Amino acid sequence: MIQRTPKIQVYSRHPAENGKSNFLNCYVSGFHPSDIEVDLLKNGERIEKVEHSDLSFSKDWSFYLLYYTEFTPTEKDEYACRVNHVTLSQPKIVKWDRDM
């Protein structure tokens, strides 16, 4: 059957200010089927106890989910989202960039 690969955006809830606690979001959308694996990473390591939204879908029937956790941006710490889906042969890692 026809499957759809996820779009991924990684971003903060509030404008990023180094040393100020915030929320790190990984929004996955546009995918089908609905099973998907999403991890948030800090310096390459999986953040524990990340929360997510309840499964729903867009007008075109593709699914979307928001994964989110507390984070404190700094100059040096690297954050990312790692996504696996049946359409992906390898997990896709998207780095957090405060300019996007």
Partner: protein, 276 residues
């Protein structure tokens, strides 16, 4: 402005891993207000917005019973669909359905909806007349004939024109301080050098509700649709949404570009430029 109540139903089979999961979520506009999940430890219709919490036990009990019955009905439907497509018992399949009602600023019905998809492909839809069906293929025609024999469209019409809009109006009143409040985008333009020859101008819209927005770039007053990177509107996690639009501009030409923003929360549409 205008408003909608919608329920989004997803059922997913998983042979060898128990029975199909059913999840229902309910929204007014961009605000989720209920969920039900057959995979929860104790499946129940649960509040997901503060303004719904005041509904009495009869509301929670009635919706929970409807949803528990729906779990079984969707499992039957998935078995039937598998047969309609001559599919093996080995594969996983998805049945999605969305239904609900739209009202205008006066609270009057604009239209109703009841549409379904199987494995991500449109399967059957109630037409806007709330009286006839559009079936995608000969499998969906089986469902159509079954729903015609049982007068399903008549039952949906009665619900969509009565119960659905009455409850939507009630929710809009109970949650008026949020559901009927449009929060405008906070906007700004950033500049990101690429090379000696070009830079990106990115126009941001942050903190807006509802999600509907128009965000565009013009050069010399001409819209730059093909040359604009426009990300999907994304949730911030505080009820609001975010979006940006970016264009690549030749060095020194930045003032020829204007970003244009329209949103229900704005008193007037905005025009912005990079301000170095």
């Amino acid at each position: 402005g205008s408003h909608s109540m919608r329920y989004f139903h997803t059922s997913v089979s998983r042979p060898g891993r128990g029975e199909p999961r059913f999840i229902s979520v309910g929204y007014v506009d961009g605000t989720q207000f209920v969920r039900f999940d057959s995979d929860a430890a104790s499946p129940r219709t649960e509040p997901r917005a503060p303004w719904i919490e005041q509904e009495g036990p009869e509301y929670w009990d009635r919706n929970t019973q409807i949803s528990k019955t729906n779990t079984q009905t969707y499992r039957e439907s998935l078995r039937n669909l598998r047969g309609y497509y001559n599919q093996s018992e080995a594969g996983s399949h998805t049945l999605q359905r969305m239904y609900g009602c739209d009202v205008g600023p006066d609270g009057r019905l604009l239209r109703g909806h009841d549409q379904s998809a199987y494995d991500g492909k449109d399967y059957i839809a109630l037409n806007e007349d709330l009286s006839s069906w559009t079936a995608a293929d000969t499998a969906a025609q089986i469902t159509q004939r079954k729903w015609e024999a049982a007068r399903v469209a008549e039952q949906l019409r009665a619900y969509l024109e009565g119960t659905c809009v009455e409850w939507l109006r009630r929710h809009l009143e109970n949650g008026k301080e949020t559901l009927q409040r449009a929060d405008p985008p906070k906007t700004h333009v950033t500049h990101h050098p690429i090379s000696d020859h070009e830079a990106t101008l990115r126009c941001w819209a942050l903190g807006f509700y509802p999600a509907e927005i128009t965000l565009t770039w013009q050069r010399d007053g001409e819209d730059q649709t093909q040359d604009t990177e426009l990300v999907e509107t994304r949730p911030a996690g505080d009820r609001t949404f975010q979006k940006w639009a970016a264009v690549v501009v030749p060095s020194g030409e930045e003032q020829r570009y204007t970003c244009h923003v329209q949103h229900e929360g704005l008193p007037k549409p905005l025009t912005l430029r990079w301000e170095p």
